[PDB]
Structure 1
Amino acid sequence: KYTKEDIFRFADEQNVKFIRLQFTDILGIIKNVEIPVSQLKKALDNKIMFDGSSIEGFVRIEESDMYLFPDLDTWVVFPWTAEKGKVARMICDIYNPDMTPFAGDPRANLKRVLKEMEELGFTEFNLGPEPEFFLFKLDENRRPTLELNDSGGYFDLAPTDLGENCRRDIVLELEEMGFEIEASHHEVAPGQHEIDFKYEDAITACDSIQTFKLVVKTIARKHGLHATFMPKPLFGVNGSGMHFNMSLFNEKGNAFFDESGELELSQTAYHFLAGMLKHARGYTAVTNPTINSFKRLVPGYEAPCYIAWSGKNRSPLVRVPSSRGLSTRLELRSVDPSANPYLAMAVLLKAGLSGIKDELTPPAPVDRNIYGMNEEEREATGIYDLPESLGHALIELEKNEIIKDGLGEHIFEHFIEAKTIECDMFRTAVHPWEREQYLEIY
């Protein structure tokens, strides 16, 4: 671990000129603030505060002021404009102005739910994310246009992948930022891109996740493209969802690796599935917290629509990678990069770990393509259907009170509040699919 004494030798050796003090509000939207190195020694004394009332979902105006205490192991110098003034950043968690951890800080909400796997004896909650994104041209006045960069397919090549050295430029800025990057490839739908990096422990992947979107949204705009993580920006082509690959660890042993059980899988792992597969209706308001992603959760675009699992199959809610061993993991296909990568782990760990204290006997793997089975056979197995909209997905969580509890209270309260606001916002609005279909006809 890093101390306050080796941060002085990264401001002075690396010759940075600023430190960006970042964090994430409830909605998964990173917000940061920039200080001259002249103040470095004040932030590290934790004496730095902001307006809480304007961070969406934190605190009300009568007690606005709130504290910022930096995290030290998260230091990463910035490899873009570094001659102008080299930049640094330290991310962290927010305290209320009494030196108490804020309950609206999602990070702290993850570190609270992380202490519930030490009593159960687990040393790391590893996660590998695959945040799939799109790339759109920028118009003459730098305003993102409806045209995508390329018309490419899956795993395609020049001349049919215009973000070739564009993605390349992303991977390099990540490489400089201590990353260990797995693969770089175009994806199924036109303009769809994926860039794979190795898993880290729970809160360092969330860290390396919200870190990831900034490297792509700025660096794509140096190639003239606007990157987006909206789940289904285009109707009719593969939405871009952020697959969550998770594994539990126990003293250098992956607790999910046991080559005896039917699929070379362990018992703490089969148990973990049903931990999610019964409360999956619950958290698909957390893990899919946007009106748009309920357009991705519709069948046929290698996105999950029903609650089941299988080995190697890219139809169901859980897919078991044909590779195993230490790289053993459980892939959850419903999370999309419009989720909050902190609220996700707390909401999925508790949901998951709920199936180690009871373990609730997971079902049989639907080992077909689950897209094309009738309502007469979705019934036959008993596979729950996934929430139609956010309207339904919300009431399906205030009923799962193990998920409501992996959310604290503050974070739950401001959420069903906010997402019923957006959900009600959109239900009353007349957008022009209803004018075409009905105006000219009735």
Structure 2
Amino acid sequence: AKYTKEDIFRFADEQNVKFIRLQFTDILGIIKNVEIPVSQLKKALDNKIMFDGSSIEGFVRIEESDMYLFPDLDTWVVFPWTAEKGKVARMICDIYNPDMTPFAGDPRANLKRVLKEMEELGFTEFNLGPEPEFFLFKLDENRRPTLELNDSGGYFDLAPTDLGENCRRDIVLELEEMGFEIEASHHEVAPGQHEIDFKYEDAITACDSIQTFKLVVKTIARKHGLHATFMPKPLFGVNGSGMHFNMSLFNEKGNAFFDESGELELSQTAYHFLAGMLKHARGYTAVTNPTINSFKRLVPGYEAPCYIAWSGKNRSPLVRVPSSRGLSTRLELRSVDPSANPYLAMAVLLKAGLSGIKDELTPPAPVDRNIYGMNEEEREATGIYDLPESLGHALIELEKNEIIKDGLGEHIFEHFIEAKTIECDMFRTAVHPWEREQYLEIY
């Protein structure tokens, strides 16, 4: 109980907020909210706010249903970019049915249910540290994004320098002032691409931090006349954007992935988690990469994980184990992209990893032979397998796998399948300028 009702009332009185955003996330990952005056703060705290519940279902909404908007007190945050005409505050809200039951279609409720399963299994918390990457594009005269980048930087380069602008520095400073924990920020290898690293907190707080980070990055960029994009592959021939998850499992004693007497300073729980992640990776590749453009990033190379393997020496595997040990022991999954929904992503990941622990699966031997060059026979000889190359194959894998369905729940599963199938069908029937430019003259 970080905050209480009286604390929220006192904060609203003493920083004098007049606008409150009760925000939530739908299946597609879009940040949605209802906006109320500060005079209705009491009704929000009393959990009596109605809203059109079909909104969270996305564009496939059919039947309107009124449902509650139970908020969370620990997520009270006041934005500074509010001028003098009243402050603005946001609160992450749970979705509840009118019968005082959490909605099955709420990703946050699904993540809470999966975490409850973890806790009743014997663990305490599921820490996550994400490393999102975003692109910045110069706006046009009509406040429209262009295809030109703000600077021609490089990997870890000091590209934006100083003396005003430097949107990454301003974003980091605003996030720090607002009350977030930032480890480090740098320039990614692609021009105009930046990465900001976060500390390690709980899974739900990790989702809240990710969503708030997306909102803050978009807002600050817009103010500085730029456009912030989290689409994985904005341009061809340019490196994509990733959201690598550094995740660790904790118990009553402490870190469950650390053991000085084990191989690689890893506990058997860590190996079971690795086996569970590797076995079902093809299953949840769709959840971790929910967009068509996401699979354009997953191409064979030296930085895009398109194989199913784990390593700790050669790096660039599907799952990488950082050299740090002790309380910082963790397993990194590099196939996640910023367009993914964090709630569903760690829901399916936790389920897969925990199933690997329940089944006590033995992970395959790590590969440190730089798996990009070996022949197809060599890859087939080892347990190396490729991730799905398109959204349709990933959807088929989702429809085949059953554990990921349980981790996602029913309602979320069918809604995700319907939306993704509609999107794939729309992409399939479209005619692109590539086909015209390479067949109009030839044929």
TM-score, shorter chain, exceeding 0.5: yes
User: Against the structure 1 CA distance between its residues 407 and 158, is the aligned structure 2 distance closer, same or farther, given a 3 Å change threshold?
Assistant: closer
- Deviations 1:388-408 (Å, cap 9, x if unpaired)? 100101111111100011111
- Asked if 1 retains the 8 angstrom alpha-carbon contact of 2:160 and 2:166, the reply is no
Q: Distance in 2 between matches of 1:371 and 1:124?
A: 36
- Could you tell me how far 1:384 is from its partner in structure 2? 1.6
Gaps of 5+ in 1: none
SS of match in other structure, 2:407: coil
Corresponding residue number in structure 2 for 1:434: 435
TM-score, length-normalised on structure 2?
0.96
- Deviations 1:322-376 (Å, cap 9, x if unpaired)? 1122111110000101100000111000001011111211001111322222212
Deviates more, 1:113-122 or 1:125-134: 113-122
SS of match in other structure, 2:63: helix
User: Against the structure 1 CA distance between its residues 82 and 161, is the aligned structure 2 distance closer, same or farther, given a 3 Å change threshold?
Assistant: closer
Q: Distance in 2 between matches of 1:326 and 1:91?
A: 29
- Could you tell me how far 1:164 is from its partner in structure 2? 6.8
User: Against the structure 1 CA distance between its residues 97 and 430, is the aligned structure 2 distance closer, same or farther, given a 3 Å change threshold?
Assistant: same
- Could you tell me how far 1:33 is from its partner in structure 2? 2.0
SS of match in other structure, 1:31: strand
- Deviations 1:203-240 (Å, cap 9, x if unpaired)? 11011111110110011112211011101111112100
- Asked if 2 retains the 8 angstrom alpha-carbon contact of 1:25 and 1:58, the reply is no
User: Against the structure 1 CA distance between its residues 200 and 163, is the aligned structure 2 distance closer, same or farther, given a 3 Å change threshold?
Assistant: farther
Deviates more, 1:52-61 or 1:301-310: 52-61
- Matched length: 442
Q: Distance in 1 between matches of 2:198 and 2:159?
A: 23
Q: Distance in 1 between matches of 2:423 and 2:76?
A: 35
Q: Distance in 2 between matches of 1:25 and 1:362?
A: 34
Deviates more, 1:82-91 or 1:37-46: 82-91
Q: Distance in 2 between matches of 1:400 and 1:158?
A: 45
Q: Distance in 2 between matches of 1:172 and 1:433?
A: 42
- Could you tell me how far 1:159 is from its partner in structure 2? 5.9
SS of match in other structure, 1:403: helix
Cα RMSD between the aligned structures? Answer: 1.7
SS of match in other structure, 2:222: helix
User: Against the structure 1 CA distance between its residues 435 and 66, is the aligned structure 2 distance closer, same or farther, given a 3 Å change threshold?
Assistant: same
Deviates more, 1:286-295 or 1:429-438: 429-438
Corresponding residue number in structure 2 for 1:405: 406
TM-score, length-normalised on structure 1?
0.97
Q: Distance in 1 between matches of 2:26 and 2:157?
A: 36
Corresponding residue number in structure 2 for 1:300: 301
SS of match in other structure, 1:253: coil
Corresponding residue number in structure 2 for 1:422: 423
SS of match in other structure, 1:185: strand
Q: Distance in 1 between matches of 2:156 and 2:163?
A: 12
Q: Distance in 1 between matches of 2:215 and 2:200?
A: 18
- Asked if 1 retains the 8 angstrom alpha-carbon contact of 2:76 and 2:90, the reply is yes
- Asked if 2 retains the 8 angstrom alpha-carbon contact of 1:155 and 1:187, the reply is yes
Deviates more, 1:285-294 or 1:376-385: 376-385
SS of match in other structure, 2:406: coil
- Asked if 2 retains the 8 angstrom alpha-carbon contact of 1:66 and 1:94, the reply is yes
Deviates more, 1:379-388 or 1:103-112: 379-388
- Asked if 1 retains the 8 angstrom alpha-carbon contact of 2:127 and 2:203, the reply is yes
User: Against the structure 1 CA distance between its residues 382 and 349, is the aligned structure 2 distance closer, same or farther, given a 3 Å change threshold?
Assistant: same
Q: Identical aligned pairs, as a percentage? A: 100
Q: Distance in 1 between matches of 2:321 and 2:255?
A: 15
- Deviations 1:125-180 (Å, cap 9, x if unpaired)? 00001111110001111101011111111011146799973111101111122111
User: Against the structure 1 CA distance between its residues 129 and 241, is the aligned structure 2 distance closer, same or farther, given a 3 Å change threshold?
Assistant: same
User: Against the structure 1 CA distance between its residues 313 and 27, is the aligned structure 2 distance closer, same or farther, given a 3 Å change threshold?
Assistant: farther
